[PDB]
Amino acid sequence: ETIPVFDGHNDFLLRLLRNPANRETIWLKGDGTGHLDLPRMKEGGFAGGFFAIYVPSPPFELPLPPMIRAEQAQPVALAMAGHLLWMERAARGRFKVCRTAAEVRSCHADGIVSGIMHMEGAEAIGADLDALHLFHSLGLRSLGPVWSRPTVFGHGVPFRFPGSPDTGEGLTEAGRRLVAECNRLKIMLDLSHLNEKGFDDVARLSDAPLVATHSNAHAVTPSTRNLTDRQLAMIRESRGMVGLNFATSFLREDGRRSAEMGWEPVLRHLDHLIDRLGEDHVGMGSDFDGATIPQGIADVTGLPALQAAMRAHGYDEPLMRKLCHENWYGLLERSWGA
């Protein structure tokens, strides 16, 4: 009675980027490192998720990395998109890249692992947006305009604790064009990493539900990466969605990276998000393979232990199902049509 989980964000693709020669083993067998691979997804009741294409750069605060332009980002983003299509070839029907809400739901029914092509940081898209149309043809259905790094579209938050997400300038003209064009193409915009001014611009300009695929409650942990109550109110009004990030740095009240922590911070964030957003607007946004996560979860096979903790906390079965997958599926329908 593990409930299948659909997840808001993972960086498994980055592992294939860094060791392409070993891709067969890492994806199909596992290489005994990291949080994810196909057998462990199955063992832990991972139903699918958004798979990020993320172009990497070469009290605390990390400096912002330099901007990467489309010429340098494009080959890396193509490499990662190429690995995601390869995963589907190699898994011979047990994994499917989905481009519609109906496809996600059919995978769920069929026990086929679903994947949504997601871009975290829009460096591979030029200010002209021509590449946005190309990526959309390839299957891209979700885009975070920024990572924690300046782009031609706007600005992401630096990693800092404690601090407000109001960390810099809002969207550029090109970023405002990017919102309008993702709305028209029905590409879900992802606000995670975006700074508060950029968030405000999206809230003002987008005609679609506001989404943060992997961010927690700033009221609970004041990381610059978490969402204030004001931002949560805006997400709620838009009938949007927030995916809970399993990064220890965004869960612990002290904002420390340490994995030595119990279920209380996880439940504290989940309670706060559910309380403010509503039961229909919260899900999982693990950041599997992109963060250090609680020792209690450890990797994707830790999802059943997380559910057991949520159950013990008193979340009823209908709410467990919404939190594990149903809320994401309804969000996809509200964002893309269904």
Q: Where on the chain is the footprint of a copy of itself (CB under 8 A)?
A: 20, 70-71, 74-75, 78-79, 81-83, 85-86, 89, 128, 130-131, 133-134, 137-139
The answer to whether 272 is annotated as binding is: no
Partner touching 52 among Mg ion, a copy of itself, none, CB below 5 to 8 Å by kind: Mg ion
- Shortest distance in whole angstroms from residue 219 CB to a copy of itself: 42
Query: Under rule CB under 5 A, which residues in 10-29 are in contact with Mg ion?
Result: 11
The residue among 290 and 294 lying less far from Mg ion, judged by its C-beta, is: 290
Element (H, E) at 308: helix 303-312
# residues near Mg ion by CB under 5 A:
5
DSSP string covering 172-221, please?
-HHHHHHHHHHHHHTPEE--TTB-HHHHHHHHHH-SS--EETT--BTTTS
Query: Under rule CB under 5 A, which residues in 118-157 are in contact with Mg ion?
Result: 120
Element (H, E) at 113: strand 113-120
Phi and psi at residue 30, to the nearest 5°: 95, 150
Interface residue with Mg ion among 52, 101, 124, 235 (CB under 5 A) is 52
The residue among 247 and 309 lying less far from Mg ion, judged by its C-beta, is: 247
Q: Contact 33/75 with Cβ under 8 angstroms?
A: no
In sign, the C-alpha dihedral spanning 251, 254, 260, 263 is negative
Partner touching 290 among a copy of itself, Mg ion, none, CB below 5 to 8 Å by kind: Mg ion
* Side chain identity at residue 206, one-letter code: S
Phi and psi at residue 6, to the nearest 5°: -105, 130
- Shortest distance in whole angstroms from residue 72 CB to a copy of itself: 8
The residue among 71 and 237 lying less far from a copy of itself, judged by its C-beta, is: 71
Partner touching 66 among a copy of itself, Mg ion, none, CB below 5 to 8 Å by kind: none
The residue among 125 and 273 lying less far from a copy of itself, judged by its C-beta, is: 125
Phi and psi at residue 211, to the nearest 5°: -130, 140
Query: Under rule CB under 5 A, which residues in 288-317 are in contact with Mg ion?
Result: 290
Q: Contact 153/180 with Cβ under 8 angstroms?
A: no
Q: Contact 162/252 with Cβ under 8 angstroms?
A: no
Cα gap 221→227, rounded to integer Å? 9
Q: Is 7 in the site for Mg ion (CB under 5 A)?
A: no
Q: Is 54 in the site for Mg ion (CB under 5 A)?
A: yes
The answer to whether 120 is annotated as binding is: yes
The residue among 84 and 331 lying less far from a copy of itself, judged by its C-beta, is: 84
Residues of the binding site: 9, 11, 120, 193, 214, 287
Binding-site ranges for Mg ion (CB under 5 A): 11, 52, 54, 120, 290
